[PDB]
Design a protein around this ligand. Structure first.
Ligand code: 478
Ligand code: 478
Ligand code: CL
Ligand code: CL
Lengths: 99, 99
């Protein structure tokens, strides 16, 4: 797709085969969801945002699909106010910013 | 330009007569700079993200030079860890995400 930015750029995303929504966020290094339930053990991880630093759960090698693109990546789960697709995943799907 | 996302997408912009670097940020509703002097009146606002909220000054109808274009729009000013160009400004230069 080619999408403009008048509204928040949410996409449908299948993450661990569960159907969710998340914001394509070129300012996010990492991809983070609030309450998807991914199976298994996870690694503690820290992420930083406008307000400070949060402790999140890092789940490795998680399947993610966006726009027909099926990728394997790292997905954080933590108290983010909105689900975000970060640059890690966006480079895997060949996403670019254009103007 | 077509910007890939293997690194953080910084651009140089002019604001308040000064050259500043800012992150092209499709997750940011509005543009925010740290430490700039703008002349008009401002209004106090708050923005939220990862780790909580940030107090900013909202200046309305401010010029920014980004790429080759004069964009007039809202600019927020506050102690953001990184300057960001948000959707409010990117929409005015017809920026799009492509994937
Ligand atoms: C640029 C904003 C962050 C300033 N604001 C918040 C204030 O905490 C602000 C925090 C701050 C100080 C210095 C640099 C950067 C930030 N301290 C402040 O300036 O005092 C200083 C000047 C000398 O002594 C103490 S604000 O404009 O006052 C305000 C208040 C409430 C809301 N909702 C919105 C804005
Ligand atoms: C969380 C999104 C929805 C909103 N933020 C934009 C995001 O791109 C934000 C940009 C940023 C980069 C580095 C340090 C600080 C902030 N990155 C971010 O948090 O990266 C996290 C999530 C995964 O990787 C790490 S914002 O900064 O809170 C924000 C809110 C409102 C306005 N007007 C402008 C900015
Ligand atoms: Cl256990
Ligand atoms: Cl700068």
């Amino acid at each position: 797709p080619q999408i403009t930015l008048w509204k928040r750029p949410f996409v449908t995303v299948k993450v661990g085969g569960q159907l969710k929504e998340a914001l394509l966020d070129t300012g996010a290094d990492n991809t983070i969801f609030e309450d998807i339930n991914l199976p298994g053990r996870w690694k503690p991880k820290m992420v930083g945002g406008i307000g400070g630093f949060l402790k999140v759960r890092e789940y490795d090698q998680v399947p993610i699909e966006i726009a027909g693109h099926k990728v394997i990546g790292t997905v954080l789960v933590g108290p983010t106010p909105v689900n975000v697709i970060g640059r890690d995943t966006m480079t895997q799907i060949g996403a670019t910013l254009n103007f």
